[PDB]
Amino acid sequence: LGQIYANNDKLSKRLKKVWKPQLFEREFYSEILDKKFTVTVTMRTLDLIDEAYGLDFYILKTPKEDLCSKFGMDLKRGMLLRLAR
Amino acid sequence: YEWGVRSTRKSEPPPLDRVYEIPGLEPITFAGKMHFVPWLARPIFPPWDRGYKDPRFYRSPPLHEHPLYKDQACYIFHHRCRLLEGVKQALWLTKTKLIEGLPEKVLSLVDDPRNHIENQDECVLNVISHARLWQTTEEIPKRETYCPVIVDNLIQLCKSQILKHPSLARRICVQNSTFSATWNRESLLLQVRGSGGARLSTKDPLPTIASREEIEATKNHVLETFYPISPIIDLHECNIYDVKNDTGFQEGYPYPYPHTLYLLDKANLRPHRLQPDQLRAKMILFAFGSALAQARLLYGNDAKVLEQPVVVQSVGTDGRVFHFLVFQLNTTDLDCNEGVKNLAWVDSDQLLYQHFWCLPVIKKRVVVEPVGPVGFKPETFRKFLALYLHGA
Amino acid sequence: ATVPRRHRYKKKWAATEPKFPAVRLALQNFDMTYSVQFGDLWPSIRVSLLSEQKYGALV
Amino acid sequence: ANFVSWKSRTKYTITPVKMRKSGGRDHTGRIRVHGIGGGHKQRYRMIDFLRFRPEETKSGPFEEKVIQVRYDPCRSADIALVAGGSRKRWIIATENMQAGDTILNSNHIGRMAVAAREGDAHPLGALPVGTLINNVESEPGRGAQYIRAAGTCGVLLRKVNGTAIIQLPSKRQMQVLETCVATVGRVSNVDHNKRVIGKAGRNRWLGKRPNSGRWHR
Amino acid sequence: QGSLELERVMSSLLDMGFSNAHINELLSVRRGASLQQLLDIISEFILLGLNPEPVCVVLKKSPQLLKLPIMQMRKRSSYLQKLGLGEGKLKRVLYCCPEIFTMRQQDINDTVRLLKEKCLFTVQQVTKILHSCPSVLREDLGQLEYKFQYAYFRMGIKHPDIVKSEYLQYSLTKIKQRHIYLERLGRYQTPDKKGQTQIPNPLLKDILRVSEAEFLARTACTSVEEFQVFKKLLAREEEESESST
RNA sequence: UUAAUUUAUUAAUGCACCUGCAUUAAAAAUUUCGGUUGGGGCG
Ligand SMILES: [Mg+2]
Ligand SMILES: [Mg+2]
Ligand SMILES: [Mg+2]
């Protein structure tokens, strides 16, 4: 939630601007929870799965702020408590 | 085109919290704190069943788990069904034959000059003027008030020949008694549930009018078919019903036989009333219903043709027009559309008076229609006497 | 509403007493007087007096 | 948001249902449409526009009769009671549609053209090449959305390779598959366009309200 | 099955309205295309109010028209029938420019939008434009808005007189020469804030409708050599002003 | 408003919808309306 100018120079009228992520809805598979999910996902999360070489990997490799989502951080509790027992 | 828009239908549930889609954990909800919290997970509640049972909060089972949800559909008649084809629909589902006009023996009882009430032209005009002008405190009575007064005051006039005829003391007029009768037509089951007012009861049978040669003469007549109207239209389709035949009374009841039925159009509104074409259809069904209540009682539940037939008449009215019907029941094997059949003598559009002016009309200070009935017909009261004296 | 791109001067020209223009006030005072002494020769000269001039060389 | 609509019945009856008029308002209370509000009260008759609606158990062609043809207040046409069997309907009526007339439905496409009487319901495929149709669907099974005002009709023109283009009253030829059910024979109230309402109060009895007073350019 | 495949198409086309030879004249046209591909083509033409006699005129002219596939053609047929070009009004469109069914959607849509909103034509006015002059679609978009507003402001003629007199089928090469010349003659004069000064403007029959052979005797009729300098004087006037301004 | 600055916003397409950058319009938003002759028979 930020602000811009008109034609890329300071001496013009000031405008507000909301940048939003492009939202994909892809289907994934969790090897540890053995159910498939229907998940709202972005470009860079998909790239963060491949750069982590796994989706069960990514939810256990990131701290709180790096995913920053109540569902994915519940997946961090839900999957790792499966591992705890 | 589906009826009922989305905004007025049942609201869809909110999409489920994603806490449920992980099988590893249990959800942390506001089941503990017994109030809504927006920042806790949405709980699922168990289907709650009322442990006790309550009279003012009773819930019925659905219509596939009642004690009697039988698959065969019955079709039931009551006092509110308004037939589409009118009499022609009522003729087929009774298997009765239409003869226009009252028979010769009924009209012969009023032909004798001694069988007249005193002032039969004047005392009717006093009953009309009492009910439609003189009854209430209000200036004009509505049809829901003077229609039950006219016939039950005209009964009182017809009852006053009891000194002349001592057989008139064998009758009562019970109100609010419910009869029923069932019959099968070609396949399907049909029922009457007669819930009406003022049936007048006698302990003697009414004598048969039509001879057995006339009943033998009914084989040649074919029931008139009509298509694309099926003869089931505007009857209550009910899949939950008990096949029962009721005479309206238990065993050992004095006056066990109906004599005449006093049907009415008691509504104030013409859309809420019965048309004369539809009112004579209820005359066929209640008179057949009270007659078939005794064919299922005095002879049992067998399909045959009656040796000593039963006859029940009926009197129909609106408050201004009168209809008269005598129904003769003589067959019970109603599954076949051929063979013998019943016969009924009806009377169409037989009006007591044309108009009643309850208040004077003014057209430049000079009255053109004074108070009282206009177009009064004294012939209808003879017919209403003739049905009252039949069999007595 | 229709608005121009380039031909902006050629719309909503006013009548007699036109207030604005500079160069067509010379135009409208040439229609009447040169129609008397030239006859049907006024059309020939007006196209030449508005299009372009041919120049000459003074060596 | 206190605009729960009167469109709430989910069960078909012939009886007149009370209509709650709006006055031009919507669910937020704002006007979107100007010039309606007030008028004589009206009751709604649910008109069945899927005229080929098959009855219970039975199916195939089946056939109807007319009871009464009465004026509809919520319409510009003349509606008719039409009863087949144990079910009675509210449909729109054609021009020469009296009480007791012989009408039929079908869903069969013959190898030869089918002669229309004056009021039958048939698919567009089993009809003549230039016959005069009525209420038509747009994608087979919907119901009648299209032409029903008063005497509004079109023609089937040409039928080429499993497709019948019909002609709307506005000359806007459009493509309809040749299995949509359609009433045939000219719609009732053929002298509705020749009406003169006389007073200013007739179209304030109808529900309409006067226009604004700004002079626009 | 291959021999019977010709028979059922000939059975369906005979109901459609062809002859024995004209069906067999279509067998020399199907280069590349199959027979099932063919029958969906011909039907979709005849469905849009085409008689079987003009349809061979466009197909013998344009033999590449059959390789257009099935799903894009039904979307092309629906958009054009929205515009009211069906039932015989598509015939004059198809003969003069045969490439209508294969050229792109947006250039048709950018053209109808510039006419309907920027030029403020009505719906029947666009349809009468598209029937009369189908050469409007092959013309560049910025040049189309110029030739309207030249009629609207410099020539001054209103909306119905543009549509009826077939104005948009003449080029800007032709129309600048025959307007500014008749303007500077004192024979044409632009209308005022209300209209004109003293003379009646001539009709567009006497200005635009005569061809090059019939121009010099009917429209000009003053001197044959007189216009020829001004043909090129306005051309130099066109060249310098476009570059400098 | 055919004054200046803008197109975030709605409506269209550009390299099914969404989203990110462009083009053309619609709706508007913000801000101002020098000085010297004002009645002029209109510089
Ligand atoms: Mg108005
Ligand atoms: Mg006005
Ligand atoms: Mg000063």
Swiss-Prot record, chain A:
The keyword Nucleus does not apply. Found in a variety of normal tissues including spleen, testes, thymus, liver, kidney, brain, adrenal, lung and retinal tissue. GO terms for cellular component: cytosol; mitochondrial inner membrane; mitochondrial large ribosomal subunit; mitochondrial ribosome; mitochondrion. One of its GO terms (molecular function) is structural constituent of ribosome. It is found in: Mitochondrion. Keywords: Mitochondrion, Ribonucleoprotein, Ribosomal protein, Transit peptide. Its main location: mitochondrion. GO terms for biological process: mitochondrial translation; translation. It comes from the Eukaryota. The keyword Disulfide bond does not apply. Belongs to the bacterial ribosomal protein bL28 family. Component of the mitochondrial large ribosomal subunit (mt-LSU). Mature mammalian 55S mitochondrial ribosomes consist of a small (28S) and a large (39S) subunit. The 28S small subunit contains a 12S ribosomal RNA (12S mt-rRNA) and 30 different proteins. The 39S large subunit contains a 16S rRNA (16S mt-rRNA), a copy of mitochondrial valine transfer RNA (mt-tRNA(Val)), which plays an integral structural role, and 52 different proteins. Interacts with OXA1L. This is Large ribosomal subunit protein bL28m. The lineage of its organism: Eukaryota, Metazoa, Chordata, Craniata, Vertebrata.
Swiss-Prot record, chain B:
It is found in: Mitochondrion. It comes from Homo sapiens. One of its GO terms (biological process) is translation. One of its GO terms (molecular function) is RNA binding. Keywords: Mitochondrion, Ribonucleoprotein, Ribosomal protein, Transit peptide. Transmembrane segments: none annotated. Its main location: mitochondrion. GO terms for cellular component: mitochondrial inner membrane; mitochondrial large ribosomal subunit; mitochondrial ribosome; mitochondrion. Component of the mitochondrial large ribosomal subunit (mt-LSU). Mature mammalian 55S mitochondrial ribosomes consist of a small (28S) and a large (39S) subunit. The 28S small subunit contains a 12S ribosomal RNA (12S mt-rRNA) and 30 different proteins. The 39S large subunit contains a 16S rRNA (16S mt-rRNA), a copy of mitochondrial valine transfer RNA (mt-tRNA(Val)), which plays an integral structural role, and 52 different proteins. mL37 forms a heterodimer with mL65. InterPro entries: mtLSU_mL37 (IPR052482), Ribosomal_mL37/mL65 (IPR010793). Belongs to the mitochondrion-specific ribosomal protein mL37 family. This is Large ribosomal subunit protein mL37.
From Swiss-Prot, chain C:
It comes from the Eukaryota. The chain holds residues 19 to 77 of 384 of the full protein. Belongs to the class I-like SAM-binding methyltransferase superfamily. RsmB/NOP family. It is found in: Mitochondrion. Mitochondrial RNA cytosine C(5)-methyltransferase that methylates cytosine to 5-methylcytosine (m5C) in various RNAs, such as rRNAs, mRNAs and some long non-coding RNAs (lncRNAs). Involved in mitochondrial ribosome small subunit (SSU) maturation by catalyzing methylation of mitochondrial 12S rRNA; the function is independent of MTERFD2/MTERF4 and assembled mitochondrial ribosome large subunit (LSU). Targeted to LSU by MTERFD2/MTERF4 and probably is involved in a final step in ribosome biogenesis to ensure that SSU and LSU are assembled. This is 5-cytosine rRNA methyltransferase NSUN4. Heterodimer with MTERFD2/MTERF4; this interaction seems to be required for NSUN4 recruitment to the mitochondrial large ribosomal subunit.
Curated annotation (Swiss-Prot), chain E:
It is found in: Mitochondrion. The keyword Mitochondrion applies. Disulfide bonds: none annotated. It comes from the Eukaryota. MTERF repeats lie at residues 56-86, 91-118, 123-153, 159-184, 204-232. The mature mitochondrial protein exists in 2 forms differing at the level of their N-terminus, one is starting at residue 43 and the other at residue 48. Residues 224-241 are annotated as: Dimerization with NSUN4. GO terms for molecular function: double-stranded DNA binding; rRNA binding. Keywords: Mitochondrion, Repeat, RNA-binding, rRNA processing, Transit peptide. GO terms for biological process: camera-type eye development; heart development; mitochondrial ribosome assembly; mitochondrial transcription; protein targeting to mitochondrion; regulation of DNA-templated transcription; rRNA processing. One of its GO terms (cellular component) is mitochondrial large ribosomal subunit. The keyword Transcription regulation does not apply. Its main location: mitochondrion. Regulator of mitochondrial ribosome biogenesis and translation. Binds to mitochondrial ribosomal RNAs 16S, 12S and 7S and targets NSUN4 RNA methyltransferase to the mitochondrial large ribosomal subunit (39S). Heterodimer with NSUN4; this interaction may be required for NSUN4 recruitment to the mitochondrial large ribosomal subunit. The MTERF repeats form a half-donut shaped, right-handed superhelix, where the concave side displays a positively charged path for nucleic acid interaction. Belongs to the mTERF family. This is Transcription termination factor 4, mitochondrial. It comes from Homo sapiens (Human). The chain holds residues 87 to 331 of 381 of the full protein.
